[PDB]
Amino acid sequence: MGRYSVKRYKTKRRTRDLDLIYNDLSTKESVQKLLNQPLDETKPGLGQHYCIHCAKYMETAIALKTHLKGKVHKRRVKELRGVPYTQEVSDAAAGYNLNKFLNRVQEITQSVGPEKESNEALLKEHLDSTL
Amino acid sequence: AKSLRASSHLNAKSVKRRGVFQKAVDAREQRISDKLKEDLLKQKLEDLKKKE
Amino acid sequence: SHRKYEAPRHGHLGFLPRKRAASIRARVKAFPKDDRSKPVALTSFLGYKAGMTTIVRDLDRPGSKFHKREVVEAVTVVDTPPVVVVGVVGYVETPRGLRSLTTVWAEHLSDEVKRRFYKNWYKSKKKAFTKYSAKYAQDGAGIERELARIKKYASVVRVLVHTQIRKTPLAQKKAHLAEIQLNGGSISEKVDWAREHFEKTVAVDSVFEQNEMIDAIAVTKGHGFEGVTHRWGTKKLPRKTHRGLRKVACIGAWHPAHVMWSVARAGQRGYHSRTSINHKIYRVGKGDDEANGATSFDRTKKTITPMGGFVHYGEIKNDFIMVKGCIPGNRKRIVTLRKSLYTNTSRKALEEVSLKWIDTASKFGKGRFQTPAEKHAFMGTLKKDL
Amino acid sequence: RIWNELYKVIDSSDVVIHVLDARDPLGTRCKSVEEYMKKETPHKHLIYVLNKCDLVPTWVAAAWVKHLSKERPTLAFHASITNSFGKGSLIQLLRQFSQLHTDRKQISVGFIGYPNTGKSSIINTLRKKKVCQVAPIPGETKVWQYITLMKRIFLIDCPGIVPPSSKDSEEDILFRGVVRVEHVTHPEQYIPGVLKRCQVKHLERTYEISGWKDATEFIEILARKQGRLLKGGEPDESGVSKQILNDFNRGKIPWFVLPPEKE
Amino acid sequence: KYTGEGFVEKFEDILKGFPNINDVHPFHRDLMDTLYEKNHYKISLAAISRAKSLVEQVARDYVRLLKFGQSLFQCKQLKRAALGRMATIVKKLRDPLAYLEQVRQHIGRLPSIDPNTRTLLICGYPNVGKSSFLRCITKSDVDVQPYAFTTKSLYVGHFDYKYLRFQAIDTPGILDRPTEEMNNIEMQSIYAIAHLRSC
Amino acid sequence: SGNGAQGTKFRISLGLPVGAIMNCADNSGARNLYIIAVKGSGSRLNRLPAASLGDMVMATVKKGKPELRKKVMPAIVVRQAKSWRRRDGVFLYFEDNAGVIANPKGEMKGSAITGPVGKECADLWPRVASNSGVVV
RNA sequence: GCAGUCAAGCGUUCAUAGCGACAUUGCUUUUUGAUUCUUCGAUGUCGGCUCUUCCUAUCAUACCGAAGCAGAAUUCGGUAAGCGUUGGAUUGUUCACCCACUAAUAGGGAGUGAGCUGGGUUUAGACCGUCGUGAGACAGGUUAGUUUUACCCUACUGAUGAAUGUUACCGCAAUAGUAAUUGAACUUAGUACGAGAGGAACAGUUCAUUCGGAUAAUUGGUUUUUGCGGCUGUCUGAUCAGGCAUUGCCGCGAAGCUACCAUCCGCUGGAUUAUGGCUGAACGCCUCUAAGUCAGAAUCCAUGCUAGAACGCGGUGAUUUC
RNA sequence: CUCUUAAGGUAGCCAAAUGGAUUAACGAGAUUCCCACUGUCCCUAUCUACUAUCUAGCGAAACCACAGCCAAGGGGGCUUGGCAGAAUCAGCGGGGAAAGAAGACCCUGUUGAGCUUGACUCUAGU
RNA sequence: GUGAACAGCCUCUAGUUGAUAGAAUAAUGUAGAUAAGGGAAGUCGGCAAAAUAGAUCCGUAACUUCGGGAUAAGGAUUGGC
RNA sequence: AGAACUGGCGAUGCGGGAUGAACCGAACGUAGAGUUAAGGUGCCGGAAUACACGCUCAUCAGACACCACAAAAGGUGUUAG
RNA sequence: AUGGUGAACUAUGCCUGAAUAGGGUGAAGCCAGAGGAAACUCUGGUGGAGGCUCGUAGCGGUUCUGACGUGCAAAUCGAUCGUCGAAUUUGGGUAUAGGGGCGAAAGACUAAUCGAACCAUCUAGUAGCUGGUUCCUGCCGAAGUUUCCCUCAGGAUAGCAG
Ligand SMILES: Nc1nc2c(ncn2[C@@H]2O[C@H](COP(=O)(O)OP(=O)(O)OP(=O)(O)O)[C@@H](O)[C@H]2O)c(=O)[nH]1
Ligand SMILES: [Mg+2]
Numbered sequence A: 001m002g003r004y005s006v007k008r009y010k011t012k013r014r015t016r017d018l019d020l021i022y023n024d025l026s027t028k029e030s031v032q033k034l035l036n037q038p039l040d041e042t043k044p045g046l047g048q049h050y051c052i053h054c055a056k057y058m059e060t061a062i063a064l065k066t067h068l069k070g071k072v073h074k075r076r077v078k079e080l081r082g083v084p085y086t087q088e089v090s091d092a093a094a095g096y097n098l099n100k101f102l103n104r105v106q107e108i109t110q111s112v113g114p115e116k117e118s119n120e121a122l123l124k125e126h127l128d129s130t131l
Numbered sequence B: 001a002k003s004l005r006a007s008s009h010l011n012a013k014s015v016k017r018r019g020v021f022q023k024a025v026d027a028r029e030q031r032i033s034d035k036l037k038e039d040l041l042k043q044k045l046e047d048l049k050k051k052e
Numbered sequence C: 001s002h003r004k005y006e007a008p009r010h011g012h013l014g015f016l017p018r019k020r021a022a023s024i025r026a027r028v029k030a031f032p033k034d035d036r037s038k039p040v041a042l043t044s045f046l047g048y049k050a051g052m053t054t055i056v057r058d059l060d061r062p063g064s065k066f067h068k069r070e071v072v073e074a075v076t077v078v079d080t081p082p083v084v085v086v087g088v089v090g091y092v093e094t095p096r097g098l099r100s101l102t103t104v105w106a107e108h109l110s111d112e113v114k115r116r117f118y119k120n121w122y123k124s125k126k127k128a129f130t131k132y133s134a135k136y137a138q139d140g141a142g143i144e145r146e147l148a149r150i151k152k153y154a155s156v157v158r159v160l161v162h163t164q165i166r167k168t169p170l171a172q173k174k175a176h177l178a179e180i181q182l183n184g185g186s187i188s189e190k191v192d193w194a195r196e197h198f199e200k201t202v203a204v205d206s207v208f209e210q211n212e213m214i215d216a217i218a219v220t221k222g223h224g225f226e227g228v229t230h231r232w233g234t235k236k237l238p239r240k241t242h243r244g245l246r247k248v249a250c251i252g253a254w255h256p257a258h259v260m261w262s263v264a265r266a267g268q269r270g271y272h273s274r275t276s277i278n279h280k281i282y283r284v285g286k287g288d289d290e291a292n293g294a295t296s297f298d299r300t301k302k303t304i305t306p307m308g309g310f311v312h313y314g315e316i317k318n319d320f321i322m323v324k325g326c327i328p329g330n331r332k333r334i335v336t337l338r339k340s341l342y343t344n345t346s347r348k349a350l351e352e353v354s355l356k357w358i359d360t361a362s363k364f365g366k367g368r369f370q371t372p373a374e375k376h377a378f379m380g381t382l383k384k385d386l
Numbered sequence D: 001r002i003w004n005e006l007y008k009v010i011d012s013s014d015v016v017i018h019v020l021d022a023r024d025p026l027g028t029r030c031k032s033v034e035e036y037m038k039k040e041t042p043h044k045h046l047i048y049v050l051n052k053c054d055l056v057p058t059w060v061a062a063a064w065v066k067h068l069s070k071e072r073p074t075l076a077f078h079a080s081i082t083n084s085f086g087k088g089s090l091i092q093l094l095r096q097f098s099q100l101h102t103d104r105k106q107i108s109v110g111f112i113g114y115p116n117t118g119k120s121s122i123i124n125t126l127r128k129k130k131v132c133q134v135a136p137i138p139g140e141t142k143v144w145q146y147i148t149l150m151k152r153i154f155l156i157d158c159p160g161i162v163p164p165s166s167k168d169s170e171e172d173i174l175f176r177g178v179v180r181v182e183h184v185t186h187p188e189q190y191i192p193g194v195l196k197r198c199q200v201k202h203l204e205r206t207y208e209i210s211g212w213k214d215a216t217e218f219i220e221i222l223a224r225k226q227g228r229l230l231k232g233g234e235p236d237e238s239g240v241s242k243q244i245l246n247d248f249n250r251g252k253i254p255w256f257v258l259p260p261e262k263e
Numbered sequence E: 001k002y003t004g005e006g007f008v009e010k011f012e013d014i015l016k017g018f019p020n021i022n023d024v025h026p027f028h029r030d031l032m033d034t035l036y037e038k039n040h041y042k043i044s045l046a047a048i049s050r051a052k053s054l055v056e057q058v059a060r061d062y063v064r065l066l067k068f069g070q071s072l073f074q075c076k077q078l079k080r081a082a083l084g085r086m087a088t089i090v091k092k093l094r095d096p097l098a099y100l101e102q103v104r105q106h107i108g109r110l111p112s113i114d115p116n117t118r119t120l121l122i123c124g125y126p127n128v129g130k131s132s133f134l135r136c137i138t139k140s141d142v143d144v145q146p147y148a149f150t151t152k153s154l155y156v157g158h159f160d161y162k163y164l165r166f167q168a169i170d171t172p173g174i175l176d177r178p179t180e181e182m183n184n185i186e187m188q189s190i191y192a193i194a195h196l197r198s199c
Numbered sequence F: 001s002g003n004g005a006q007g008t009k010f011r012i013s014l015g016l017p018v019g020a021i022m023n024c025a026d027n028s029g030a031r032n033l034y035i036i037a038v039k040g041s042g043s044r045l046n047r048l049p050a051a052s053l054g055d056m057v058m059a060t061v062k063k064g065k066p067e068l069r070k071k072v073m074p075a076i077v078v079r080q081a082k083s084w085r086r087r088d089g090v091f092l093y094f095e096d097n098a099g100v101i102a103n104p105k106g107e108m109k110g111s112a113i114t115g116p117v118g119k120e121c122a123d124l125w126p127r128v129a130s131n132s133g134v135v136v
Numbered sequence G: 001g002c003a004g005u006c007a008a009g010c011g012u013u014c015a016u017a018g019c020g021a022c023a024u025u026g027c028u029u030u031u032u033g034a035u036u037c038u039u040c041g042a043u044g045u046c047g048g049c050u051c052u053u054c055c056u057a058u059c060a061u062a063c064c065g066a067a068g069c070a071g072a073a074u075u076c077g078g079u080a081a082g083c084g085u086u087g088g089a090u091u092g093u094u095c096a097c098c099c100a101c102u103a104a105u106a107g108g109g110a111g112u113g114a115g116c117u118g119g120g121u122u123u124a125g126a127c128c129g130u131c132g133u134g135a136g137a138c139a140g141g142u143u144a145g146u147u148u149u150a151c152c153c154u155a156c157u158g159a160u161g162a163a164u165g166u167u168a169c170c171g172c173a174a175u176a177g178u179a180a181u182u183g184a185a186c187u188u189a190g191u192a193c194g195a196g197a198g199g200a201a202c203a204g205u206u207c208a209u210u211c212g213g214a215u216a217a218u219u220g221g222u223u224u225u226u227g228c229g230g231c232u233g234u235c236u237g238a239u240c241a242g243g244c245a246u247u248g249c250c251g252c253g254a255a256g257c258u259a260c261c262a263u264c265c266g267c268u269g270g271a272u273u274a275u276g277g278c279u280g281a282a283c284g285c286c287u288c289u290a291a292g293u294c295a296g297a298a299u300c301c302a303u304g305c306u307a308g309a310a311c312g313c314g315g316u317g318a319u320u321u322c
Numbered sequence H: 001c002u003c004u005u006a007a008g009g010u011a012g013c014c015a016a017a018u019g020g021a022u023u024a025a026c027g028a029g030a031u032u033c034c035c036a037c038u039g040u041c042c043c044u045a046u047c048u049a050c051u052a053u054c055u056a057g058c059g060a061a062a063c064c065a066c067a068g069c070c071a072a073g074g075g076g077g078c079u080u081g082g083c084a085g086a087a088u089c090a091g092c093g094g095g096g097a098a099a100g101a102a103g104a105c106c107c108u109g110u111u112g113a114g115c116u117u118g119a120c121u122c123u124a125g126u
Numbered sequence I: 001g002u003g004a005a006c007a008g009c010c011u012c013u014a015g016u017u018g019a020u021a022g023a024a025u026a027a028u029g030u031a032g033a034u035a036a037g038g039g040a041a042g043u044c045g046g047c048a049a050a051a052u053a054g055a056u057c058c059g060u061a062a063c064u065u066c067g068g069g070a071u072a073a074g075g076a077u078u079g080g081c
Numbered sequence J: 001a002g003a004a005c006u007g008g009c010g011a012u013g014c015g016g017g018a019u020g021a022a023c024c025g026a027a028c029g030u031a032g033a034g035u036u037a038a039g040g041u042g043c044c045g046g047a048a049u050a051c052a053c054g055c056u057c058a059u060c061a062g063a064c065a066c067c068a069c070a071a072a073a074g075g076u077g078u079u080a081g
Numbered sequence K: 001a002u003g004g005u006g007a008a009c010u011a012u013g014c015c016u017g018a019a020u021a022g023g024g025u026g027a028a029g030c031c032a033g034a035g036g037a038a039a040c041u042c043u044g045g046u047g048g049a050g051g052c053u054c055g056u057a058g059c060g061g062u063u064c065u066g067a068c069g070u071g072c073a074a075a076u077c078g079a080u081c082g083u084c085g086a087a088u089u090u091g092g093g094u095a096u097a098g099g100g101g102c103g104a105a106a107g108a109c110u111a112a113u114c115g116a117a118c119c120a121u122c123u124a125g126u127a128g129c130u131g132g133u134u135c136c137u138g139c140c141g142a143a144g145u146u147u148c149c150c151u152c153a154g155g156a157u158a159g160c161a162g
């Protein structure tokens, strides 16, 4: 209603949403594409220099390090731990395809979860080894 | 465009009025005129509840 | 000069002068003709409209892009408790106007009509058609002579009625009067009808049905003294202009040396008698016939009335008319519903409508649950219940 | 409004002179007026002045006066209130044109040309103080003014003139100082202009920067070195192109169009 | 000004409209000679091109006088003096405009033929048959009447063989002659056989 | 509507006015399209010709390939960002404003449209619906 | 315009004393659509926002007439002012131009110098140029610069109101105002018409443009409901519950108001114009006209819609006991 | 009396590092553009306080020939028409020799006094 | 007390609680705010608002009288325990 | 346009021309009666909706400035030569 | 014109007093370390310069279609802005006086007075032009034209009236 929440959360000034960040940290293709990339002319660090968590290009390699050691980073790293929230949750909570929601939670518990964690380990290795 | 008042259109419309398009109305008047008669007879029975 | 940029004016010169009406009750100005042949029929019913709600349907409009495809819309509910007939006036036609020359009354009349005729009920001895019915004793004779007059002369017959405001959730005790025209044939049939209907009552079905282009009049929503800018729709002068930005800047010229009747000024807004015409009846419900808000499609046994009632208004316990769009007027008024003035199969006024879901969610907030059963079920057991 | 101002000072003046940008004098000549002058007013004398003879090499100015002294007299010239060249040459030349018209009592002398060529500055370097206004922008003077020296001679200065030919073309009108660069819509598209005009060594010396391919690179590499870029993190195409097109016409980056080959 | 640009409109639509006889295509370039006469054609338009320029000149010269006009009378006379000159220029254009009006009517009514498509010419003496071939091979209304020069211009008709648009051309007929002089009617056919490709 | 637009165009809320940059969905290589006029627009005093979803607009490329720049061309809008009502009852809106460039007949330059094309735009123009991967 | 030429006529009578209509010849720059980049001293203020109305000398919409008008599109003309006529760029100036939408971007009048302004009135400051021995002024050019109503009468817009026995309810309608507009979709159709390219329209249907009158179901906006929660600083010993921060700030927020930023609705009877006709004279042919008469434009007068004469009018109710 | 066009290949010889005023810095100095941002605008809507408004007490001023409805004509009042019904309240900014800034901006005086010149007559000083 | 601060904000001692009131909550104003989508299309002119702002660390161009320009520009952060 | 003469107004009311410096009439003490001027006699408005002979129909006649201007002519409008 | 009175406002000089948070930058000098034959050339400190800089009180007065225009006010109020350690701000004392003073020069300022202050007198200064000019009745009743002074103004002169 008032001015702050308006001029952060307009439709124009929208961040990437956590579902798609979870799906880009899920598998080692979509990590390593975002880690490599081409040289873009537009984007801050001529591409490059990109936290996958906070979907955010930096200028320098140094101003990544200072980002990574910070509560603004650790904010999102907590938010991406659990099941990432989709329509299946808010449907199931009414009482409407539980079994698809339970089969999703089973696969995220068993198959996808430790895969996407074991990617984040390789991010923690890759970023700190490069920097 | 043609106006509301255009002679061609109002001469066209008057051919429609007469045919299928008044028959709808003159059925509906006969449907209501029944219900107005059947509305009385209820109230004439409601009198006969007291006349008993 | 010559303006140099042509542009339409602001506001209609037809609707003028833009003043307050004479009565919380727009008077009808015209009735349909008189096809001297048809069965006798009331031409207009008066109710109290008191609602607004949201109806979907599917719209079997052959041609349109929404054919065989479900549409949502807004519909207003006019509550319409049955009308009762208590006078007839005969108008003779003249080289001057139409003159009325005979009102006849129904022997006994309700407390309601009496209260109409009185400005201070809480004192008056209530002494009205007492002396009238006093005359009306003996073969009644005098009344028969006056009915005879009407039969003989007269070229329209108008029926006087009133309402049963004592049945509306509304609190004003005092009922209205009106006049309504009978359209069927001969003075004789008309007047005989009115006689064999004195003191009786006329429901809402027996003046209407589904699918019918009916037009409403009323005196309609006041906003008091208003500005030139939001009375005519004029522009606003740029910013921090001397002597105000909400006005017409230039109002005149060296000739004529007069402000003109056409230059959009400040004054009253709303409380005018308007006619809006061609509104389609959708659903005519009966205060007995429970499960109104239901449908052949819904079956979910529930009344039109929404949760916590309508707003500023009760609960619709009688013949209600639904319409579509918006009658002029605000909740609790009195809209008189005139039928058609003319055959009108603009092929719109023809498609037999079928409603697929009537909305009965709360209006005093954000709607979420139709029936309180729904609400409770969803929430589950709460605190003090159990 | 300005072509009216032109045909005034031709009609007023007794020797028109016609100043020429000593980078590219063939482009900056104009025909048209000279064709008019011979037909209508043969008694008006007419004479070129090459100036900006700083901004090309010494043989090139010497060549151009050779290739133009065929059709008309010509001076090679350079204008500064303090540190000039051709000043005593031009005074000497005018004082002759006076002494021919010994009846006349006075003799006005006009300064036709393209914009930004140095008419107002030449008037200043004759007077040896600041008399006309001047700027690096094209359209500085808007109307004529008489300026005396020697009593018997009066200088005049009209505003600059482009003749309205179909070609021309837009980039050709750019690369002599005529358009104020601020008002062009996409400057980026014209930069392949200055890459064509300039030698790459000179453009590499100036900014400074090292090598590339296409102008779209050259702007980017420049704009990242200049540090001249928008919020997050797009390199400034328009403004940096805008500044190159200025430095070109102002004479921060050296170029010159070649004379006709010798014989 | 406004009376000036009244004419300089009206003529410009003529000059822009008419087909520009050289730099068309040598078949058409010829054909319009053999109908309309190419010199009269080119002159008549060039007269209108000149008369365009004089009206502009008269407009621009008088308007420049009319800014020094010191009373209503002087100005009024200068105005009438401008519009009389324009009227005189246009009154001197009576013979070309009558000519062009009639070539416009005719040149609309020519058939379009593509030179570049597959065609076939249909040639010979008068009275042979070669219209009634064209009548029966294709859809076309061409007259079939027993005397010599019934057809006076190139008629056309199309037909599909092997899923492909052809075009027949019936063409009025030739006599043997001493061949330096043949008629504008006969010459159409000779230039049709000369310029066009085809069978 | 004019040429290309099949059937009756139906009303929705007017998002983009004149001089309003919107993205390019097709794969021609324009980055974003600056609106300069709206076809089938009225005339009122002081009103600005406003486009909406499924409307043809004249549009200059501001950033992109040098070939596509420096010339106006038609374009169909495929996402609005301002909300509009569907006649089945819901208001809705997309993440951002978007268009695709096209000839006056309504035939497309690009082979494929990225992102979700709006539903009204798909019904109105057939050749958009052919290049639409994602509808709605 | 100047200089002639022919000659229906004037010149009291009149051919050839002088004038003299309608026609008509002379160039003001090349007969082959080449360019022709010609922009050549307005010594006076207008230009624009807001808003109304009028004229018609009609740009568009309606109906007609004529054209080598086959369609399609267009040009020229007739009646016609009912109804529309836009969005921007450009002051090294715009007495204009361009490009874009559009059914169309017609021309004017009364303008809007006390409703508000930008240039110019326009003074005191200053600089540059020209002129003057100088004080100074001007062929110029550039920059900075306080006039501020209504509370009076009228007009305009809304709002009460004494008096015609009292008081109440229901009505009539003189007069005045009046409103709707434009486009394209399906179908007729890929038919008529055409060698082809291409290509309509009346019946029957569906949506939108501009305008208008409403309305708040729904979506959006707004919040002193200071409704609930939260945040900073300080203050009440702490919790609690609170105060102050010129509504302290942040989130959500019903109700109310409200938006082509939201939804609904906006007509059919008479008499005519141009023109097309009928019978039919004047005039033993003939003629749409003289008598008479049929059709026919978005026009006109009504229907419908708004107000209801506060010195226009009707019907009906009750009419005080000290 | 006779007389003036040589300099040649992307930067030249030269002169006491530079070839310069295309002068850094500073500016409530004048002007153009770009980003960001926005109710400037499309197109307006809503909210708060203090006014206005009604009441109690208190209570001025400008201005004022008389006045106060229009049309046409007479080289607000007269002539010819339209018309015209007490008493009033809130707004309003068209008109009112209703005012009011009213002076300005031109023209005329033999008139004022500020200033300047080989104007006339004197004069301090030298 | 907060804070870099005789800034602003809240308190103790001391000192005021004086300014004609009351009842409503129309238009127009004065002072002050917020606004979907677009983002200078407004205007003679981005006028006026909006945005930026404290501190720490990374980083900082042309030009220069070599002192400057420079808080250039542009980034990453900030509570509580 | 500049010269010459004679009237009218200025110092001057009154009747008529709907109204009016110069146009038509007109010798201003205060009253009464009669008769007229110019101009008028459908009604406004005092006085013939008099008498007589002709002419004219105008889809905005004319009732006049007249001895002019738009003017010279266009018409299958009417009458007399 | 004569003769007086003003520096309490304000202009400048002089004598004597008083007043001006907290930040940013970091000049010479000096110390240590690293190169050098020396001159000195790099690194880290220290030090605290400047008609330097952000910015309080102070002094000022840019901008706003600001508020208010018989106002709170014969110059105020609100917001925004300039400057803020010195060519700074300011109290008292003291000097300069009118055709003069004083002036970082605007003809600024000299007690709401300034291209020449204020007060009294000569003085009822001067009238070209403007405005006004006081009872009744009766009788008589004009003139706007020549002519010359070189002309316009200023007039002389004839004519008209009793
Ligand atoms: N190097 C060099 N530069 C010059 C010379 N003359 C002029 N310039 C530059 O050219 C620019 C333009 O000078 P102007 O005299 O205004 O040119 P202009 O068009 O005659 O000026 P206006 O008459 O006012 O239009 C100035 O900024 C000078 O710096 C020259 O001889 N040598
Ligand atoms: Mg210049």
Ligand SMILES: [Mg+2]
Binding pocket: E126, E127, E131, E143, E144, E145, E146, E147, E148, E149, E150, E151
């Ligand atoms: Mg044959």
Ligand SMILES: [Zn+2]
Binding pocket: A051, A052, A053, A054, A067, A072, A073, A076
């Ligand atoms: Zn991160």
